[model samples]
Target: MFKPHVTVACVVHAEGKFLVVEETINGKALWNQPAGHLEADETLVEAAARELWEETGISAQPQHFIRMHQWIAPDKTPFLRFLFAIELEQICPTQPHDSDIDCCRWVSAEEILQASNLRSPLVAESIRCYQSGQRYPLEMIGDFNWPFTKGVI
Candidate 1:
């Protein structure tokens, strides 16, 4: 069986800086956009918002659809990542409950690219895509409900 992981990432930009989260992976601290896997029964936009808050504690919602990238990890795991652009009114404090996230910082695009460790190439690629002025309307995605449920109103 071939299963591609579905994930969501937000290139949260505010005051000319993008939000990056420092996470300890494999005993090494790596920087990455506030991103994570999509949960079941949630729309892509919803998942993006949830991940942004869960990882960085930034309450802003995704404002634009950036781009989707399909990548295969060195271990042969495939991933379909949905990237979105979000602007924050103000930078909020990170939630201490997120143990996976060591810290969060806002850095310029160049700074992010120059970082020694990154969770994945998608981090830089997502910023480049956002800097290129590419944006799609949120209406590009539509949610549908299947008829195989047993719920009463």
Candidate 2:
């Protein structure tokens, strides 16, 4: 079987609020955290930073890996996402690049229940996981390389 493609997501928290994005995908409005696929030559942390800036215009420094989740779409396209917990560090005005984002808002965990337009269950689930302090060791993840490792040959 083929391995799931690697992806990345960032859960940015600031002053008891979480960052969320409202974007129209396929003409349907969807709510999601600033996230995207890992690009070539980019470390997971770098991908998180790039995705955050590209989607929210906020230059965030991703601190650590918090979770790793594997999900499969209905079509069986598997996605393995590296979830990172990042601090906002500073507040800055943000605008979506081009038409990629319709609006960006900060929502409390309790308020997320009212947003049925979420791009997927991942957003809520990710926040819940973070709130619960649930995390896995980066060493336990198996699908991708441990970029820092180099064996003596």
TM-scores for all candidates?
0.89, 0.81
What TM-score would candidate 2 get against the native?
Answer: 0.81
Looking at model 1, the pairs that clash are none
Candidate 1 accuracy as TM-score: 0.89
Error of 1 at 124 (Å): 0.7
- Each prediction's number of clashing residue pairs: 0, 0
Runs off by more than 4 Å, candidate 1:
145-153
Worst lDDT 10-window in candidate 2 = 142-151
lDDT of 2 by residue, 28-137 (tens): 99888889888776666777778888888888677667887788867677899788887665545778773688888887887775678888778888888889876554
lDDT of each: 0.84, 0.77
Residue 112 lDDT, candidate 1, scale 0-100: 90
lDDT of 1 by residue, 1-153 (tens): 878999999988878788889988899999999998988877888888888888877676689898899999888889999999888776556662478998898888899977789998888888889989979987686466643342256
